[PDB]
């Protein structure tokens, strides 16, 4: 019996809307578990997101299941989706990001 992916720290995900002062770090987390161990990837505005096009790139951590962006700027505004998948199943969550002048 393998197990579809599930969130391991739901309580940590509750702050869905993030209104961040320009210059601060935003950290988005989607801790999951499953068998086999799920993979995580991020979308921005529905598009695969690697941070090739943002100043400073991103930190990714499969270890922490997190997306980390330092020095947020206006063009960072958007919707960030974490897709957690394994052979068995699929789960997704959205964080909303705003950046304050």
């Amino acid at each position: 019996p393998q197990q579809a992916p599930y969130w391991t720290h739901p309580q940590r995900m509750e702050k869905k809307l993030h209104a961040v002062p320009a210059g601060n770090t935003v950290k988005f987390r989607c801790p999951a578990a499953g068998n086999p161990t799920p993979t995580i990837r991020w979308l921005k505005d529905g598009q695969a997101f690697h941070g090739e096009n943002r100043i400073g790139g991103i930190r990714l951590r499969h270890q922490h299941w997190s997306l980390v962006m330092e020095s947020v700027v206006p063009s960072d505004r958007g919707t960030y989706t974490c897709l957690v998948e394994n052979a068995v199943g699929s789960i997704r969550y959205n964080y909303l990001l705003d950046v304050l002048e």
């Epitope: 969130w7 739901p10 995900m13 509750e14 702050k15 869905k16 809307l17 993030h18 209104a19 529905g46 206006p74 505004r77 958007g78 919707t79 989706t81 789960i91 997704r92 969550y93 959205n94 909303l96 990001l97 705003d98 950046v99 304050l100 002048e101």
Partner: antibody
Amino acid sequence: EVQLLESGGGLVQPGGSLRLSCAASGFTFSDYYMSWIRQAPGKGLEWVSTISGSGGSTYYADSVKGRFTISRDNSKNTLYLQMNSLRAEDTAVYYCARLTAYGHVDSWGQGTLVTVSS
Amino acid sequence: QSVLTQPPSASGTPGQRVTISCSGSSSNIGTNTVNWYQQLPGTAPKLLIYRNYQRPSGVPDRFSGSKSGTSASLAISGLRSEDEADYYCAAWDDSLSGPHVVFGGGTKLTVLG
């Protein structure tokens, strides 16, 4: 004291346009996500649209997508709902709502009634 | 109609316990926080429960929110006449279209006797 003051509702023909406004005070307006939620009389709540503090992100119910536009003027502390191609089924009381970091409403306007009828 | 499902009506006699249910899916209730609103006639909704189970200041212990899986529950114990109102559950929903807010269709609570 938080204050959300709707204006602009009224009677409109099918196909016509109408802009709702909502004037905010008692809080830093540009920090908050703001929503429009509507209720047809004697019917349930339905979410219409949300906008982010800066105005940079925009989200719409399927039934209004491509007819309504949410916007805001932060220097006037005002939220707007531009409504176009109005259909009868758009008749409702429209409410301004303030959102928290947790995605729920923590403050509502009094509502403005919009009637779409020939 | 609504993407969350509530029973249209609920009844109780004073001092009874009533529970209004709210059925959803994994993309809304399963993953996102549930909120409950109470609405009196000709007035704006009032927050009863946020982040699944928390009560705002001013909302008595008689109202308690819970959820399990894709189903949420508003339990009202010590039913009072002044509880008659419409009740709505609500949550964000992470669908394929992107995130949107979904409401239950509302439950009319009647206090009997």
